[PDB]
Scaffold this active site. Structure first.
Site, PDB file in Angstrom:
ATOM      1  N   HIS A 122    -114.899  21.806 -49.236  1.00 13.98           N
ATOM      2  CA  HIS A 122    -114.516  20.539 -49.828  1.00 13.98           C
ATOM      3  C   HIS A 122    -113.014  20.447 -50.060  1.00 13.98           C
ATOM      4  CE1 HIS A 122    -118.672  18.988 -51.302  1.00 13.98           C
ATOM      5  NE2 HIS A 122    -118.502  18.881 -49.986  1.00 13.98           N
ATOM      6  N   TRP A 171    -110.295  15.754 -52.323  1.00 10.61           N
ATOM      7  CA  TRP A 171    -110.345  16.823 -53.297  1.00 10.61           C
ATOM      8  C   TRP A 171    -108.987  17.474 -53.504  1.00 10.61           C
ATOM      9  CZ3 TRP A 171    -114.199  16.030 -49.658  1.00 10.61           C
ATOM     10  CH2 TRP A 171    -115.524  15.893 -50.118  1.00 10.61           C
ATOM     11  N   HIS A 203    -124.317  19.809 -41.914  1.00 10.63           N
ATOM     12  CA  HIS A 203    -125.496  18.990 -42.104  1.00 10.63           C
ATOM     13  C   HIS A 203    -126.528  19.210 -41.013  1.00 10.63           C
ATOM     14  CE1 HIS A 203    -124.534  15.749 -45.297  1.00 10.63           C
ATOM     15  NE2 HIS A 203    -124.245  16.971 -45.699  1.00 10.63           N
ATOM     16  N   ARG A 210    -118.328  19.020 -41.448  1.00 13.54           N
ATOM     17  CA  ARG A 210    -119.513  18.513 -42.147  1.00 13.54           C
ATOM     18  C   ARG A 210    -120.693  18.315 -41.203  1.00 13.54           C
ATOM     19  NH1 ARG A 210    -121.653  13.395 -45.644  1.00 13.54           N
ATOM     20  NH2 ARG A 210    -122.166  14.699 -47.508  1.00 13.54           N
TER      21      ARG A 210
HETATM   22  C1  HEM Z   1    -124.128  20.852 -53.318  1.00  9.56           C
HETATM   23  C2  HEM Z   1    -123.661  20.765 -51.979  1.00  9.56           C
HETATM   24  C3  HEM Z   1    -122.871  19.695 -51.437  1.00  9.56           C
HETATM   25  C4  HEM Z   1    -122.867  18.391 -51.771  1.00  9.56           C
HETATM   26  C5  HEM Z   1    -123.699  17.627 -52.792  1.00  9.56           C
HETATM   27  C6  HEM Z   1    -121.919  17.738 -50.932  1.00  9.56           C
HETATM   28  C7  HEM Z   1    -121.593  16.400 -50.968  1.00  9.56           C
HETATM   29  C8  HEM Z   1    -120.591  15.766 -50.230  1.00  9.56           C
HETATM   30  C9  HEM Z   1    -120.309  14.354 -50.288  1.00  9.56           C
HETATM   31  C10 HEM Z   1    -120.966  13.329 -51.189  1.00  9.56           C
HETATM   32  C11 HEM Z   1    -119.332  14.164 -49.353  1.00  9.56           C
HETATM   33  C12 HEM Z   1    -118.571  12.907 -49.062  1.00  9.56           C
HETATM   34  C13 HEM Z   1    -119.199  12.205 -47.844  1.00  9.56           C
HETATM   35  C14 HEM Z   1    -118.381  10.958 -47.595  1.00  9.56           C
HETATM   36  O1  HEM Z   1    -118.355  10.026 -48.455  1.00  9.56           O
HETATM   37  O2  HEM Z   1    -117.760  10.896 -46.520  1.00  9.56           O
HETATM   38  C15 HEM Z   1    -119.005  15.403 -48.731  1.00  9.56           C
HETATM   39  C16 HEM Z   1    -118.014  15.574 -47.795  1.00  9.56           C
HETATM   40  C17 HEM Z   1    -117.785  16.804 -47.142  1.00  9.56           C
HETATM   41  N1  HEM Z   1    -118.523  17.948 -47.313  1.00  9.56           N
HETATM   42 FE1  HEM Z   1    -119.961  18.286 -48.632  1.00  9.56          FE
HETATM   43  N2  HEM Z   1    -121.345  18.649 -50.051  1.00  9.56           N
HETATM   44  C18 HEM Z   1    -121.922  19.868 -50.335  1.00  9.56           C
HETATM   45  C19 HEM Z   1    -121.762  21.030 -49.606  1.00  9.56           C
HETATM   46  C20 HEM Z   1    -120.908  21.176 -48.512  1.00  9.56           C
HETATM   47  C21 HEM Z   1    -120.846  22.362 -47.692  1.00  9.56           C
HETATM   48  C22 HEM Z   1    -121.763  23.534 -47.938  1.00  9.56           C
HETATM   49  C23 HEM Z   1    -119.940  22.107 -46.714  1.00  9.56           C
HETATM   50  C24 HEM Z   1    -119.596  22.902 -45.555  1.00  9.56           C
HETATM   51  C25 HEM Z   1    -119.403  24.269 -45.607  1.00  9.56           C
HETATM   52  C26 HEM Z   1    -119.435  20.778 -46.929  1.00  9.56           C
HETATM   53  C27 HEM Z   1    -118.437  20.176 -46.204  1.00  9.56           C
HETATM   54  C28 HEM Z   1    -117.995  18.852 -46.389  1.00  9.56           C
HETATM   55  C29 HEM Z   1    -116.846  18.261 -45.713  1.00  9.56           C
HETATM   56  C30 HEM Z   1    -115.998  19.058 -44.746  1.00  9.56           C
HETATM   57  C31 HEM Z   1    -116.715  17.000 -46.196  1.00  9.56           C
HETATM   58  C32 HEM Z   1    -115.688  15.953 -45.853  1.00  9.56           C
HETATM   59  C33 HEM Z   1    -116.209  15.047 -44.737  1.00  9.56           C
HETATM   60  C34 HEM Z   1    -115.216  13.998 -44.285  1.00  9.56           C
HETATM   61  O3  HEM Z   1    -114.046  13.961 -44.718  1.00  9.56           O
HETATM   62  O4  HEM Z   1    -115.611  13.163 -43.424  1.00  9.56           O
HETATM   63  N3  HEM Z   1    -120.058  20.192 -48.041  1.00  9.56           N
HETATM   64  N4  HEM Z   1    -119.812  16.395 -49.276  1.00  9.56           N
END
Ligand code: HEM
Length: 291
Positions: A172, A188, A49, A45
């Site tokens: 995700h 997820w 970001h 992430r």
């Molecule tokens: C419409 C696009 C996206 C939205 C709205 C979104 C939103 C989110 C949200 C709300 C979280 C949870 C953050 C937390 O509470 O720790 C998250 C986690 C994550 N997202 Fe996204 N995301 C999107 C796209 C992506 C993309 C494009 C990637 C990478 C290719 C990505 C990779 C991750 C990963 C790996 C996590 C888990 C982080 C953790 O476990 O600490 N996301 N995302």
């Protein structure tokens, strides 16, 4: 603003494989983080970001300048929790002070995906740190409470098409939402530190219920204890996204290949690679090296 990749002086593939390896060894060692999820997901992430602030219209943001190290960006509410990935990388940067910040944040993501048994992600060096005033403002990362139209329009700014979006969203599978971070809670799926196409399978196959979480936000929840954000769920509400979701749910290799391309692309938006730049590097995993 043109951002030309500039190879860290004298460095070559072996130097970056050493950085890879140090990241990968720390990922293995520091396994307790996040209730034993480990740092893989948050490093993915972080890479996203730090890249996803890019605006194709004027080449602001993006991975090149490594601007997350400045307080406006590290304190973006959208980046809540990523400080854990940054702190992970700090001893890496101390050992290898020659690597640029953008190169390290992006390489962290590559290394995490690969060490989690994901596809190989070719990676190019040459990001150069840019000054504090080049840090993009907050608000360029996406909201999770929106629909497919939002998602599609959002990602046009990153020059991603439907296939690229659906592929990237497969990340995700990894990690989880944390209520105090994003206002969403739950993983997820079950395999959340191994890179697979589970996100698509769960979208299609779980029985989802639209519920409110303890932060009063709606999310989709299953009896297995999994969740989907509204933006995740939009991928099966929109018929164009749905077709692609089904493709990836039914072909792991295709997902791997498309993810790899899209993720490299994400990590490289905004960067101009000279004609005589090195070819992209494909790092060996620790396992492939016998380490
Ligand atoms: C419409 C696009 C996206 C939205 C709205 C979104 C939103 C989110 C949200 C709300 C979280 C949870 C953050 C937390 O509470 O720790 C998250 C986690 C994550 N997202 Fe996204 N995301 C999107 C796209 C992506 C993309 C494009 C990637 C990478 C290719 C990505 C990779 C991750 C990963 C790996 C996590 C888990 C982080 C953790 O476990 O600490 N996301 N995302």
């Amino acid at each position: 603003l043109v951002h030309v990749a500039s190879v860290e002086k004298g460095r070559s593939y072996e130097d970056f494989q050493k950085v890879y390896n140090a990241i990968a060894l720390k990922l293995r060692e520091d396994d307790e983080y996040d209730n034993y999820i480990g740092y893989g997901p948050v490093l993915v992430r972080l890479a996203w970001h730090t890249s996803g602030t890019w605006d194709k219209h004027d080449n602001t943001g993006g991975s090149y300048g490594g601007t997350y190290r400045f307080k406006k960006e590290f304190n973006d509410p959208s980046n809540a929790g990523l400080q854990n990935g940054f702190k992970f990388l700090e001893p890496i940067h101390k050992e290898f002070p020659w690597i640029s910040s953008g190169d390290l944040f992006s390489l962290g993501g590559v290394t995490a995906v690969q060490e989690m048994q994901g596809p190989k992600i070719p990676w190019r060096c040459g990001r150069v740190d840019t000054p504090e005033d080049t840090t993009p403002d907050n608000g360029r990362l996406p909201d999770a409470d929106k629909d497919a139209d939002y998602v599609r329009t959002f990602f046009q700014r990153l020059n991603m098409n439907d296939r690229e979006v659906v592929a990237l969203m497969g990340a995700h599978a990894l990690g989880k939402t944390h209520l105090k971070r994003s206002g969403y809670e739950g993983p997820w799926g079950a395999a959340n530190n191994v890179f697979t196409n589970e996100f698509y399978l769960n979208l299609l196959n779980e029985d989802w219920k639209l519920e409110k979480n303890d932060a009063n936000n709606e999310q989709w929840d299953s009896k297995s204890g999994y969740m989907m954000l509204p933006t995740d769920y939009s991928l099966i509400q929109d018929p164009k996204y749905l077709s692609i979701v089904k493709e990836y749910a039914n072909d792991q290799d295709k997902f791997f290949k498309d993810f790899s391309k899209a993720f490299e692309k994400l990590l490289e938006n905004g960067i101009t690679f000279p004609k005589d730049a090195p070819s992209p590097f494909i790092f060996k995993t620790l396992e492939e090296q016998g380490l």
